Amino acid sequence: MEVLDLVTGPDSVTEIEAFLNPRMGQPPTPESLTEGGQYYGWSRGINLATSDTEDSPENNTLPTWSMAKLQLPMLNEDLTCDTLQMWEAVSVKTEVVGSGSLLDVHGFNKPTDTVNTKGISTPVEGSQYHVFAVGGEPLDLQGLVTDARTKYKEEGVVTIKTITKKDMVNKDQVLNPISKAKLDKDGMYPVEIWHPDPAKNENTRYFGNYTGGTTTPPVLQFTNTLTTVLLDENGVGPLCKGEGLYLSCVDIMGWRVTRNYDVHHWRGLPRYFKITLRKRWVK
Amino acid sequence: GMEVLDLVTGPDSVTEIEAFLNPRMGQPPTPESLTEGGQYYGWSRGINLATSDTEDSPENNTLPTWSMAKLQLPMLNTLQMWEAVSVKTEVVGSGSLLDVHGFNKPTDTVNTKGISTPVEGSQYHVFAVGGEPLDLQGLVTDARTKYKEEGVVTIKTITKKDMVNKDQVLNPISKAKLDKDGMYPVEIWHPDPAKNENTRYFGNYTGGTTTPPVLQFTNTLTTVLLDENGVGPLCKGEGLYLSCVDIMGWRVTRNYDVHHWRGLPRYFKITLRKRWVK
Amino acid sequence: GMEVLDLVTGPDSVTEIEAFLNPRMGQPPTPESLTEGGQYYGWSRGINLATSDTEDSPENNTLPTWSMAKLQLPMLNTLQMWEAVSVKTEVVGSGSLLDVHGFNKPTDTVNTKGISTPVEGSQYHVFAVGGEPLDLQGLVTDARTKYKEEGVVTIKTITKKDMVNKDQVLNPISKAKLDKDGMYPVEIWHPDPAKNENTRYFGNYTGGTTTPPVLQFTNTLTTVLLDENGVGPLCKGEGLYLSCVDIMGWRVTRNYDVHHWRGLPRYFKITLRKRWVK
Amino acid sequence: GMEVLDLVTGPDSVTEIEAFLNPRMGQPPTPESLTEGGQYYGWSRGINLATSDTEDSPENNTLPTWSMAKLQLPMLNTLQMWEAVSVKTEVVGSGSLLDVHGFNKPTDTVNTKGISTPVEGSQYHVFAVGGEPLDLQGLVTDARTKYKEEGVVTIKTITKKDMVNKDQVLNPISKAKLDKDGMYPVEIWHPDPAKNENTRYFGNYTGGTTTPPVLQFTNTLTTVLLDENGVGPLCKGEGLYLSCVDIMGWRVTRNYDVHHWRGLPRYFKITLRKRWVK
Amino acid sequence: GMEVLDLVTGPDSVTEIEAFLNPRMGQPPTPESLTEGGQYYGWSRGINLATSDTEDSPENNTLPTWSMAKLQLPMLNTLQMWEAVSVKTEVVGSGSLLDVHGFNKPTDTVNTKGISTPVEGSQYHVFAVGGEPLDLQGLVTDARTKYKEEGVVTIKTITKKDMVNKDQVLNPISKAKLDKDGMYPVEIWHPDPAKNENTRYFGNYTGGTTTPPVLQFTNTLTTVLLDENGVGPLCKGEGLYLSCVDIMGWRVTRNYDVHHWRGLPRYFKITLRKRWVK
Numbered sequence A: 001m002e003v004l005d006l007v008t009g010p011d012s013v014t015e016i017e018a019f020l021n022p023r024m025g026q027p028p029t030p031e032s033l034t035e036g037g038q039y040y041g042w043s044r045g046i047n048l049a050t051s052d053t054e055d056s057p058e059n060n061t062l063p064t065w066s067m068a069k070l071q072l073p074m075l076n077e078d079l080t081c082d083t084l085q086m087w088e089a090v091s092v093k094t095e096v097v098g099s100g101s102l103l104d105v106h107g108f109n110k111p112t113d114t115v116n117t118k119g120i121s122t123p124v125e126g127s128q129y130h131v132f133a134v135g136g137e138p139l140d141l142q143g144l145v146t147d148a149r150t151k152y153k154e155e156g157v158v159t160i161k162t163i164t165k166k167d168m169v170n171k172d173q174v175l176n177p178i179s180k181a182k183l184d185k186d187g188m189y190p191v192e193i194w195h196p197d198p199a200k201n202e203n204t205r206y207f208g209n210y211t212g213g214t215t216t217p218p219v220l221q222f223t224n225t226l227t228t229v230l231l232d233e234n235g236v237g238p239l240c241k242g243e244g245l246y247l248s249c250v251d252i253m254g255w256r257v258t259r260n261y262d263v264h265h266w267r268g269l270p271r272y273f274k275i276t277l278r279k280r281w282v283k
Numbered sequence B, C, D, E: 001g002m003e004v005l006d007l008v009t010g011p012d013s014v015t016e017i018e019a020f021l022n023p024r025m026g027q028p029p030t031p032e033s034l035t036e037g038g039q040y041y042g043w044s045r046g047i048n049l050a051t052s053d054t055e056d057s058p059e060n061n062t063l064p065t066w067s068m069a070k071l072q073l074p075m076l077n078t079l080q081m082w083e084a085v086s087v088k089t090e091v092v093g094s095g096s097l098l099d100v101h102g103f104n105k106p107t108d109t110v111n112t113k114g115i116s117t118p119v120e121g122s123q124y125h126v127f128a129v130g131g132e133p134l135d136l137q138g139l140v141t142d143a144r145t146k147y148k149e150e151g152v153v154t155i156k157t158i159t160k161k162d163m164v165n166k167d168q169v170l171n172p173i174s175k176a177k178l179d180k181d182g183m184y185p186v187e188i189w190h191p192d193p194a195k196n197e198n199t200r201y202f203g204n205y206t207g208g209t210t211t212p213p214v215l216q217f218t219n220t221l222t223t224v225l226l227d228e229n230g231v232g233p234l235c236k237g238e239g240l241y242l243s244c245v246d247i248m249g250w251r252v253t254r255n256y257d258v259h260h261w262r263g264l265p266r267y268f269k270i271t272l273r274k275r276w277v278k
């Protein structure tokens, strides 16, 4: 694809917006606040391996990637034309919303005074993971796991075995180029398995950060004044193949810890995207 | 006043206004008495905890809320509007946290010695300047939390219905405007990134229980409020809206580790200029 | 005095002045005797704690206060004024905190072994350069604190009335000027962002009890003092005011965890030029 | 090609090459079997400790080593050489550390509950791109350490003599080249700043035992490899050398707190251009 | 030559010189024997503590001291002087801190298991490049500290009198020059910001007892030594002075938590140019 001039004229630039809700483990339904809906925005209680050779995490304890495909206005009446137009993502304003809610320390989490069961309800703390991507095709994924012996469910999550039709190999604990996928479904690809593939993603920009630990304070900034530029070193943004725009993210804030067996629940927050796009002549 | 034209020139075409917004941590400014509750002003009252997984009823005076003020600008009226160009803002009083001589939980609890533990823990700093109220998006830890119906504005105040599970993530139904001081809890109401076209807001959060508080202050830092097109917030009906919350953490008492939120006041000095509009 | 014109050129139109300000942590410079109290110079005396929720009376020698100096500039005299253009400032002596061979509370309390615990905890660094005293805004942790009525300047010194609940937030009545060294407690008096038009100040605070102290120092960093219009502080009556406080944390003794504040001295090298004024 | 001339223009004058380097934490890639040792690939084997002050004999499979690869470039031959201009490099797989559901030491050891403690502690990230092997300088914690003679390249491998006390500081005798993958221990061999004229390296270290691991990753960051004269690494005999190590910390087992190092793979995409040389 | 003129052009008008300065943590380079004390080279000997508030006598070999070297430049002599333009500097060997397989205090003290605790705690990194010795200002934790009279240069060495209480803050009488390697304790002697007109120095301090050490290293970073007028240090008598200290923290033994300071060597590569002076 040869990238030519910017298209000018009426409606040559557009802005589109979307929010992607977190996918921490509990699905959006049931909505009932007694039947499981109370866990929406969180994982269910993390379940642990029972031995070095018996690690079977439940699907609803595994945070997964959020994604959305946005369909842009059709540009080309005839794809056989020598010169065509594509939507180009120029920039994005993105924000993780709701960090203020972590200031709720009046609930029933493990308390800070364990002698008297007093103090405050311990706020969300621990490992944090924030990634977002904007591209003109699905985010390319590279698999890499802690333990190739982990017995992921065969139904309900897309894992390395889903792709290869074979059990994971020891190479999957490092970089195994066979273990690749595309982020083509929301709430299905676990973030402890699937990472942005630096060997592909030519038509996507992604930005990630990880902070580990168990009691690490969560940190977040938010403003409506920060623009993320999506143009590459040549001044070209992601080009939307068949007018499809792909948004991908995960925003883990840490865990809350309950008063029962120190059970941990992952917490995630929703992410806003406002993408500025322009029409680009291509051949 | 939709089409933004040239800057207005001449006498009184630029103005500076200043204000301080005091924190709204839970204890109201009155009663002033230092024995009848006034001693908690600048702080929350002691945080009260849920009694079960289904019984979380926080008292209003334990919930920090947004501070806000609407300032009236000089009368103006191709019309003219006041345009907010920049702001110098500062959180005042961090030095007061150096008081470690009080009666808080001491650092040596065995012998009741050491120092009075200073304010520590979760911190939250947001400010906004706009030409209309800050647009708010609701999102809570727990849609089952039983907020009081009177004395605070919560999601149910707006919807007239109980919160739903979607309120623990992003539910576009749960929106409000920051139109009252000391009423909108910060654990519920967040700046809405899908609106606020005419407001600039800047926020940061640092969590934890014993995290050291950190603050910088200088009179030399200017925050520019102009957008990508060089246009600042435009003050509808000559009203300028200031919004903030500045939580430094908690102090902890010697009685069952009772926590009190600590907030500090924020200064604003806004430069505004008249703008031609059509 | 008010209208700022061109820079003055010619012989001696620019000058550099330097000063060091020693910390004022609570123990005065005298007695010099290393047995009669002088051993605490550079530090506070042992921090004394409240005996109840209503009885908090800190001793003056436990309260760090602002350091300040007024320097006299060469006589001058459309008139001329000295204008402060820039400053190189440095906090000196952080290397001294590497002394872990003393008699502080040891790191192994089981065997009374390990190292002498180094200075740690809450840190506070502010400096200012101006053409008149630093304007101060009072704000306290506790309006009930019984500060001494002798040997220190507090809110009550200024107002002639006891503190009120508003003094725990921003009370605009509670203002002062930094006009004396070692007299204004830093837990009471903060730079006033509503004034200080003719001063530049820069501050930071890091809290906690065991927080590692952090400091950088170099002779290669210049702080510009010119405002947005290219004008530095103008020295009224040829007086230049320097203000600072540099708290590094506390050391802790082996006797009931008694804490002593540690401060360090700050160097200033100010570059000034003559400015025509009308 | 000592003298560097103009850039070569025309067809095929610029190229991009990519590679990934897997970590070398101690367990080799084979056996592949997940019961026969393959389950430790990407990790070290359990770190074994000294039995006395004079008996420190670490096993080879407990010692992380440098990763390296030599890539062959298109044949070229006033002569031409490949010049590395820039690199995009990324450490892949930090999300895998979010697995806290395994059988590591649990966060609640009193009841054996909570979560599986994630990887924490000392972290070390270095990468280099050059036109010849990375030059290494030896420096160790303890010159008395009894490294194996076979299976690792250590100081004694090079000198044919035991380590001396100078090897605990900078001993210029103790030098080597990174010419083999998975053989040079990172606790011994460091980039040599006195050499490496034709390589660029970038490193950082963060220590401690329970330190939270931190990592950023993006496909939008380019590292320029040009020196102060605008010249990148020149590839001798069309060979491009990539070198790295990326230690994230340790996992800790439920059996006597045995630690295993964790490494992650590093991606490189290098842009090269032809350069005229004389 | 006080007046600085044009740069000198022509053959050999620019030169580049390199050196490494080994750390001076307390144990001298000799004896070399790894049983007779050489095993501590690169480290201090075990830190010895005060026995009372009035009895603090640290041994010389427990006190880290400044490293320094004077390098002789090519002979030169309107005269010419060598001017230091820039320096590439690097602290080498942080990877050696990844040795957690030795006999230090273990991470699991209950069972004496886990890993050998890595170096942690207070860190101090300073370097300087100048045309004369680094100017030093004395400042101590405790003016009562009984430093040895022989084998170290301390305040009393210079003044011929015991330290005074002012030595715990800034006492202008307590000054020296860094004219000897491994002799000036870093807990006493600091770069003097009131002098050093012909030297650039850059320092940082991070305190605490278990703080994770942090270090970055690269061969791509240049430190410019030119002042605000574009003039670098001028080498008096063709002598170039390099000064540094690089403390990474302590290791802790299994015997009564004895601490040993760890230091690392520093590389310098200085670019110099001939300058016309009069």
Ligand SMILES: CC(=O)N[C@H]1[C@H](O[C@@H]2[C@H](O[C@]3(C(=O)O)C[C@H](O)[C@@H](NC(C)=O)[C@H]([C@H](O)[C@H](O)CO)O3)[C@@H](O)[C@H](O)O[C@@H]2CO)O[C@H](CO)[C@H](O)[C@@H]1O[C@@H]1O[C@H](CO)[C@H](O)[C@H](O[C@]2(C(=O)O)C[C@H](O)[C@@H](NC(C)=O)[C@H]([C@H](O)[C@@H](CO)O[C@]3(C(=O)O)C[C@H](O)[C@@H](NC(C)=O)[C@H]([C@H](O)[C@H](O)CO)O3)O2)[C@H]1O
Binding pocket: A034, A035, A036, A039, A043, A044, A045, A046, A047, A058, A059, A060, A061, A258, A260, A263, B053
């Ligand atoms: C309860 C249990 O042992 N669950 C266990 C499961 O055991 C199977 C059988 O349980 C059920 C069930 O989930 O209730 C019976 C159902 O009929 C069946 N549903 C259907 C549609 O067929 C399901 C279903 O088979 C399965 O869940 C699908 O995976 O199973 C049990 O009766 C029988 O003895 O054994 C059965 C098979 O072993 O088996 C699972 C493995 O297949 C799991 O082992 C499961 O344990 C749960 O695992 C999740 C992670 O997957 C998690 O760790 C969970 O721990 C939490 C949690 O839900 O996240 C941690 C929370 O902190 C904790 N909350 C509080 C406040 O303490 C929460 C509660 O303990 C739950 C446990 O379900 O109790 C409540 C609750 O949420 O508070 C109690 C409420 O009164 C109740 N509401 C009502 C209206 O009754 C809710 C409600 O049922 C659920 O929220 C709906 O999902 O549950 O545990 C860990 O328990």
Ligand SMILES: CC(=O)N[C@H]1[C@H](O[C@@H]2[C@H](O[C@]3(C(=O)O)C[C@H](O)[C@@H](NC(C)=O)[C@H]([C@H](O)[C@H](O)CO)O3)[C@@H](O)[C@H](O)O[C@@H]2CO)O[C@H](CO)[C@H](O)[C@@H]1O[C@@H]1O[C@H](CO)[C@H](O)[C@H](O[C@]2(C(=O)O)C[C@H](O)[C@@H](NC(C)=O)[C@H]([C@H](O)[C@@H](CO)O[C@]3(C(=O)O)C[C@H](O)[C@@H](NC(C)=O)[C@H]([C@H](O)[C@H](O)CO)O3)O2)[C@H]1O
Binding pocket: B035, B036, B037, B040, B044, B045, B046, B047, B048, B059, B060, B061, B062, B253, B255, B258, C053
């Ligand atoms: C005391 C109590 O049980 N409060 C409790 C409340 O109980 C109701 C009745 O108490 C009162 C009351 O607040 O005193 C009686 C009043 O007549 C009534 N007023 C009116 C106009 O009708 C109020 C009012 O109805 C209610 O507050 C409004 O909701 O109620 C009590 O007599 C009866 O037995 O039960 C009644 C309800 O059934 O009910 C509330 C819920 O409705 C709360 O449960 C409330 O508990 C307080 O809750 C807040 C959070 O909202 C907070 O956790 C508070 O804990 C603190 C605090 O005040 O923040 C934590 C502080 O750290 C702690 N300070 C110290 C130094 O220890 C502080 C003290 O323990 C308070 C307790 O009130 O004692 C002092 C004080 O501030 O130090 C003691 C002083 O001597 C006293 N001053 C004087 C001059 O006497 C002050 C002063 O009363 C108050 O500050 C004024 O507000 O109180 O507690 C937690 O107690």
Ligand SMILES: CC(=O)N[C@H]1[C@H](O[C@@H]2[C@H](O)[C@@H](O)[C@H](O)O[C@@H]2CO)O[C@H](CO)[C@H](O)[C@@H]1O[C@@H]1O[C@H](CO)[C@H](O)[C@H](O[C@]2(C(=O)O)C[C@H](O)[C@@H](NC(C)=O)[C@H]([C@H](O)[C@@H](CO)O[C@]3(C(=O)O)C[C@H](O)[C@@H](NC(C)=O)[C@H]([C@H](O)[C@H](O)CO)O3)O2)[C@H]1O
Binding pocket: C035, C036, C037, C040, C044, C045, C046, C047, C048, C059, C060, C061, C062, C253, C255, C258, E053
């Ligand atoms: C000693 C005492 O009780 N002082 C308190 C004072 O008591 C009054 C009077 O002095 C008593 O004789 C009488 O019984 O009671 C009256 C009451 O009116 O009352 C004051 C209020 O007016 C205070 O309560 C005062 O207590 C002191 O308060 C300060 C804060 O204001 C400190 O908290 C102080 O504690 C320290 C300190 O000096 O900072 C903490 C420090 O860590 C301690 N140092 C050591 C090594 O342990 C010292 C130490 O305990 C002092 C107490 O004064 O003893 C020495 C010293 O080491 O400094 C012992 C020396 O032998 C002595 N020097 C000589 C030559 O004799 C030296 C010297 O007197 C003083 O330093 C000079 O100021 O004191 O305490 C807290 O005690």
Ligand SMILES: CC(=O)N[C@H]1[C@H](O[C@@H]2[C@H](O)[C@@H](O)[C@H](O)O[C@@H]2CO)O[C@H](CO)[C@H](O)[C@@H]1O[C@@H]1O[C@H](CO)[C@H](O)[C@H](O[C@]2(C(=O)O)C[C@H](O)[C@@H](NC(C)=O)[C@H]([C@H](O)[C@@H](CO)O[C@]3(C(=O)O)C[C@H](O)[C@@H](NC(C)=O)[C@H]([C@H](O)[C@H](O)CO)O3)O2)[C@H]1O
Binding pocket: A052, D035, D036, D037, D040, D044, D045, D046, D047, D048, D059, D060, D061, D062, D253, D255, D258
């Ligand atoms: C087993 C043993 O003692 N090994 C040590 C070795 O002993 C020699 C010989 O093997 C013995 O039978 C005999 O008695 O003694 C001779 C020598 O005299 O000698 C070596 C020195 O030459 C070492 O001392 C060695 O000890 C091992 O040293 C390495 C470092 O080099 C590690 O510290 C290792 O500890 C681990 C490890 O493997 O990394 C720590 C780890 O966390 C442990 N894992 C778990 C789940 O607990 C393992 C574990 O204890 C190993 C011990 O080898 O057991 C398994 C395993 O889980 O990995 C058990 C499996 O069932 C087995 N698989 C099969 C199919 O049988 C598996 C497999 O043998 C190995 O992984 C292949 O390498 O081992 O220990 C430390 O033990």
Ligand SMILES: CC(=O)N[C@H]1[C@H](O[C@@H]2[C@H](O)[C@@H](O)[C@H](O)O[C@@H]2CO)O[C@H](CO)[C@H](O)[C@@H]1O[C@@H]1O[C@H](CO)[C@H](O)[C@H](O[C@]2(C(=O)O)C[C@H](O)[C@@H](NC(C)=O)[C@H]([C@H](O)[C@@H](CO)O[C@]3(C(=O)O)C[C@H](O)[C@@H](NC(C)=O)[C@H]([C@H](O)[C@H](O)CO)O3)O2)[C@H]1O
Binding pocket: D053, E035, E036, E037, E044, E045, E046, E047, E048, E059, E060, E061, E062, E253, E255, E258
């Ligand atoms: C041993 C002793 O008591 N030394 C103190 C010295 O005593 C003098 C004399 O040596 C004694 O025989 C006699 O009884 O008393 C006189 C003086 O009255 O006096 C000094 C003051 O003048 C000191 O008090 C000195 O104590 C030593 O002080 C230094 C600081 O100056 C250190 O704190 C030192 O502690 C360490 C150290 O050396 O740094 C801490 C370290 O962690 C320890 N290492 C280990 C592995 O445990 C060592 C260790 O205990 C030393 C003590 O010297 O023993 C060895 C060693 O391991 O280094 C044992 C070796 O076998 C030996 N080698 C040989 C071939 O014999 C080796 C060697 O002598 C020394 O390294 C040479 O310097 O010493 O202690 C603290 O002990």
